Design an enzyme around this catalytic site. Structure first.
Site, PDB file in Angstrom:
ATOM      1  N   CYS A  98       0.809  -1.146   0.000  1.00  0.00           N
ATOM      2  CA  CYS A  98       0.000   0.000   0.000  1.00  0.00           C
ATOM      3  C   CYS A  98       0.906   1.284   0.000  1.00  0.00           C
ATOM      4  O   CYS A  98       0.506   2.366  -0.304  1.00  0.00           O
ATOM      5  CB  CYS A  98      -1.044  -0.243   1.123  1.00  0.00           C
ATOM      6  SG  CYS A  98      -1.701  -1.998   1.351  1.00  0.00           S
TER       7      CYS A  98
ATOM      8  N   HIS B  56      -9.073   2.620  -3.185  1.00  0.00           N
ATOM      9  CA  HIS B  56      -7.722   2.281  -2.842  1.00  0.00           C
ATOM     10  C   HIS B  56      -7.127   1.446  -3.948  1.00  0.00           C
ATOM     11  O   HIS B  56      -7.039   0.259  -3.839  1.00  0.00           O
ATOM     12  CB  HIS B  56      -7.706   1.572  -1.499  1.00  0.00           C
ATOM     13  CG  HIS B  56      -6.366   1.106  -1.040  1.00  0.00           C
ATOM     14  ND1 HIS B  56      -5.194   1.697  -1.413  1.00  0.00           N
ATOM     15  CD2 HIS B  56      -6.020   0.086  -0.238  1.00  0.00           C
ATOM     16  CE1 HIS B  56      -4.183   1.076  -0.858  1.00  0.00           C
ATOM     17  NE2 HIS B  56      -4.658   0.082  -0.149  1.00  0.00           N
TER      18      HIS B  56
ATOM     19  N   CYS C  49      -0.480   2.748   6.084  1.00  0.00           N
ATOM     20  CA  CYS C  49      -0.326   1.397   6.498  1.00  0.00           C
ATOM     21  C   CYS C  49      -0.091   0.441   5.313  1.00  0.00           C
ATOM     22  O   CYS C  49      -0.541   0.658   4.209  1.00  0.00           O
ATOM     23  CB  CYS C  49      -1.508   0.997   7.375  1.00  0.00           C
ATOM     24  SG  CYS C  49      -3.039   0.700   6.570  1.00  0.00           S
TER      25      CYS C  49
END
Lengths: 397, 398, 399, 398
Positions: free
Chosen positions: D87, D353, D383
């Protein structure tokens, strides 16, 4: 009018992943069929149907009897089909053929079976509409089949083997007896190999470059070596007795015969070996499938006006030694009766290539009935999912 | 002894990816079978075998007749099996059933078929010993099978569809003729729905509501509308005529009937509709597979001592309108014969749920025979791979 | 501040389908990382990043440096990552590591690569949304990859192999030259084993079969390799019959991992490490995909320029032999005399050693650094062609 | 010398199986890169590397940065590459770019990310040598990745969802607070769209023709009450479960590109630098607690900068799950005012995302917002699955 069996043949039986791994079920079928016609001298146009037991079909060979006929080079005239009644599919094809003949619908047909267990498919029911929400499962064809046959209410996670274990348990069948039956299976198969009788049965198979005539799996087998092996379900159950040694494997082969009239056979120069006296079919509890032969035999003997004592020779499939011994217990066997039963071997030594298995049994019974000049033979087997099929055959003279 | 058909039934026919998408073949099979037992009041233990035509088997349901029987709650004592002669599988099961009953082996059996084209597997023969050198291929069961049925020496790359185009070229079948046939098929099916004849046929299927009507048939289907569609292989043949409109789809269904002797039916309170007189089967060129009914019908009629003119009602599978029309050219048909043919509809309007198609035809033929008080019926289909199958049925007059 | 390379190591290099077929890329990395740590005595928590060159990632190990660290028993406080620049990935990880050290961001990091070509995935993009319309394709990861690297405008259906033939043709290199080079390669490799220089590089690998045994030796290299035997072999010919490239004269597909430490001279001193080399400069270039083997020439040009160095300034060269022809083409452009072969690929190369892509850059580093020490030479060059038309080169100085 | 960001841009973000379903990651990457070049007038030979964060790479595009350059018509002289840090891969591309630049090694590079979650491959490791003994599994790349990122000593069968539920348990975060955050995210995102600021970020995408400029997921209507109605994904196994589709981010498709260079080179090209990179931090946390990774990572970055959280004008924190973000904010001792300066134009919950391109999205907002505000310091943190955190500090250029 009578239905008679001529020139019942098979290929050699290969081990899973073994001799025949490069060969499709169709290639084996063709090889067996070409050999059948070649030995017979039959004109291709004489064949009115090809009916083939085949337990693991896919879209490589739809309606497998027809594909096998064309691939063998028979004319486009010749119809064909596929049947599945599991471990009984080969006998079933034979029964259908006889029915088609006796009716007077057809004079000559081919009945057979083919299995390539080595090349069974892996399949998904998740890739058509997508896995975006569910994932993708791919199932081994051989493995899934072992648990699904009984349906929803009678599942068996331990598959075929679990059924046998139940039998061993229910009949108090010692491990020793099981290993012992297996040895005989091997000794007999092997004895048959060297006595020359097997060449009578077999169409040799050309593999891209050598030609194969001997069954791969029959072997030196002793009760002592077999005692060594570790049962499959020992961890699940500590009292397990079924092992790879005392049970039949997964195998590649094909079986073919001619089903015809006595009149038609006389015209074509054929030599009929047996005629079909009767048959019986049964349902049993799926977890007890190994016992399907008993009710089926009973039905068949009754239809025949016959008694098991009347019966000269028996072919009983040895799916698992435990399973076979249980049928033999019900039949009240005596040490002699093991004389008349499975004389040239069985599943454990030979292999169990499921579609072709009924044919193999037939080829052996009919031909052996001839060698012995004996009257009646019984063919019977257990079927995965809770079935049994049996047939009674009478020597021609 | 005779073999007679009692209470032949089906489920409704769902479209591909359609109303029965959530249902396995077994689920349809079980519903058809339960309905049949319920309608007939027959004790389960009566049923000596369940023979089922099933053309896309997999390990989810091995020897599918047996599974359907168990899952429907029949006792463990009832045997079952699976048969494939493609588009002829339903008839084949019935014929096998008659042979078993007639020989005196069995007194009552169930013959039927089940297919879920919606759920047909994708499969590979490359994943077991490695794709290391070969590459791995996954095949659609529906698509791959259209090509391979003829085997290695008779490949058909275009499929069933090319064979249909082949017949259209040979027999000079126009687009209009085909679309026109398609219209009749929709009108006859829809009319069959409104007239209420369909309910006699149908086992309603519960899905998670309850469905009693076939999905595909459309009231508004017209020639002019059909003319708009693009023939599937126009790109390759500019002379292509066969479209989604004039051919059958991929479908989900199940069919079941009882096959029994007349004495046994009497004892059980059944009403036998027809008895089987004869059958015939044939092989034809795989690229010409659509013509298979002609030789097969020839064999069946002659065994029956019968002629085509003798026949009151015909169901001929409408796999493709060009394929059906070609058969009709050989039969030297005319507009009038069209009134004795496929009278409640067919594969084009209804759909072609393959293992169960033979069953659907039989249900109509048998029931329509009883409704018309006519005598002889012929059921015949083309079989992919180059086969034909035919049967002649006689109304039971009692 | 300087960045130095410490304790560069690798596993043995396995053949596709061979020694390590039962091992994952992660398994190999873990064995190497553990070996690196065992040799160094370094506390696990000194490690601030694990950067791995890995060219066939999948979801068995996402962000593979992190997984390899956790699986090696490093504390959860240790970050990790994956990088791909094809054949150049192992070097790339080293350069990234060096930059993060040089900037003052990190004092100690691990740089590496792992590859298991034996275990590369088969994959489909037709499985998510339905296969009814399109058909479902499954691609072998390795095979598909040889054509896609150039993108749509420059597909090379031939693969890496075709680009090599393109070089043979342009530069007019006889099959003889190509085959002779392969011989030297096996010879230098084999020689290095018997000479015992390899143990310095190698972390031994345990494999469970009857017993579990430990492997120290590269599978592929052969002493008996001769030009004559190499002529017995068939180019990969139907397509071009002037085809000169065989399984004999080019790198295969392989399994291995490589690790090293990247650190400041000051930190290495604190921890008791022996720094071998420091990075002087690096360079990267792009070239036509159908001409990928030549990518080292431009990249090398850029690195020496940045170093203020010349090719004569260079005591040691490690140029990867993806293909014998590819290496020969670079060498012409470099105007190589017979003696220059003296100082190039002295311990072997891809053709003898094998080519496990992500770990390759690591393997060469291990030789160049150790050899530079054993020699007491000053400057070493590491460089490679990259599939898709790239090159990477780095200059190192012995410490 | 400094590293500065100019012209940070993205494509719109589409939903999983949505508007961008027919586009590859490369396709998005090319559009984004093309728009960047179109906007700036940068000579293609000025770009010395294209560094792209890509999380689910396959053989369709090796070294995706190089492919993207090529497919976008850049000259063969331009190198490119791929990086994965889950990520954080997009930010990781930026940090690499900045390091190569501050170094003096390159003067100008492109840093980006591209992800198509729609088209992430399904894979097997059983096919190559065969499954004759073992069986065959095929894994979804998305779902499978969520369990393995921690390795064999830290598996999370639950995936990212289970980590987020671990965080709400530990930090005691109510469902209402989670739903409230999600609502703000939609409102801010929608507001950014009304207001016209979003256009500054977006490279419009063409699909085959229609052109797309607007992110797919954000909805004006979203309310707490409507959100309350949703059912927690993991409720069956946890009675206390809060995390839902509504308060978590989805799976998304997008690309992000920017220019990384020095001030001097930017001055030369007449580029407009927005921010310079002050510092960055990375951290490892427990894989079962991955959502918290920003906290140690922010600490490192703030410390390197001589800076404090009070010193930060603007924060971009990934909203992977509302619970995870809320947990970070707790550690950070946030009060009502803080929500004022955090994720001001929306976030992962509203926007999506798209994992490789997320670092780029946040940057585009942060750098751009910081300019509109005329503020000094910005924080980007996320994160990372498998137990990581990445943070960077950016400072407005004058």
């Amino acid at each position: 009018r009578d239905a008679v069996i001529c020139e019942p043949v098979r290929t050699p039986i290969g081990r899973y992943g073994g001799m025949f791994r490069s060969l499709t079920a169709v290639d084996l079928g063709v090889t067996a069929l070409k050999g059948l016609l070649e030995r017979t001298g039959i004109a291709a146009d004489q064949v009115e149907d090809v009916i083939l037991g085949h337990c693991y079909p896919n879209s490589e060979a739809p309606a497998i009897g027809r594909v096998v006929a064309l691939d063998a080079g028979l004319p486009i005239t010749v119809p064909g089909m596929q049947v599945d009644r599991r471990c009984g599919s080969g006998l079933q094809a034979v029964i259908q053929a006889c029915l088609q003949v006796r009716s007077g619908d057809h004079d000559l047909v081919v009945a057979g079976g083919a299995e390539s267990m080595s090349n069974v498919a892996f399949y998904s029911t998740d890739m058509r509409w997508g896995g975006a929400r569910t994932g993708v499962q791919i199932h081994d064809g051989l493995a899934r089949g072992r648990t699904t046959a009984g349906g929803k209410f009678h599942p068996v996670p331990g598959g075929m083997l679990e059924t046998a274990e139940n039998l061993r348990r229910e009949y108090h069948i010692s491990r020793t007896e099981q290993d012992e039956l297996a040895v005989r299976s091997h000794q007999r198969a092997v004895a048959a190999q060297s006595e020359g009788v097997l060449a009578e049965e077999i169409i040799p198979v050309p593999v891209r470059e050598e030609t194969i005539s001997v069954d791969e799996h029959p072997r030196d087998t002793t009760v002592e070596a077999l005692a060594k092996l570790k049962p499959v379900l020992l961890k699940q159950d500590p009292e397990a007795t079924v092992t790879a040694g005392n049970s039949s494997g997964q195998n590649d082969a094909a079986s073919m015969c001619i089903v015809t009239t006595p009149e038609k056979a006389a015209e074509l120069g054929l030599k009929p070996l047996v005629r079909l006296v009767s048959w019986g079919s049964a349902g049993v509890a799926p977890d007890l499938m190994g016992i399907g032969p008993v009710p089926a035999t009973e039905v068949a003997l009754a239809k025949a006006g016959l008694t098991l004592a009347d019966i000269d020779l028996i072919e009983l499939n040895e799916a698992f030694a435990a399973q076979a011994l249980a049928v033999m217990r019900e039949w009240k066997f005596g040490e002699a009766d093991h004389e008349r039963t499975n004389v040239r071997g069985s599943g454990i030594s030979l292999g169990h290539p499921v579609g072709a298995t009924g044919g193999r049994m037939l080829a052996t019974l009919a031909r052996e009935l001839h060698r012995r000049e004996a009257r009646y033979g019984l063919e019977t087997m257990c079927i995965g999912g809770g079935q049994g099929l049996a047939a009674v055959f009478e020597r021609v003279q």
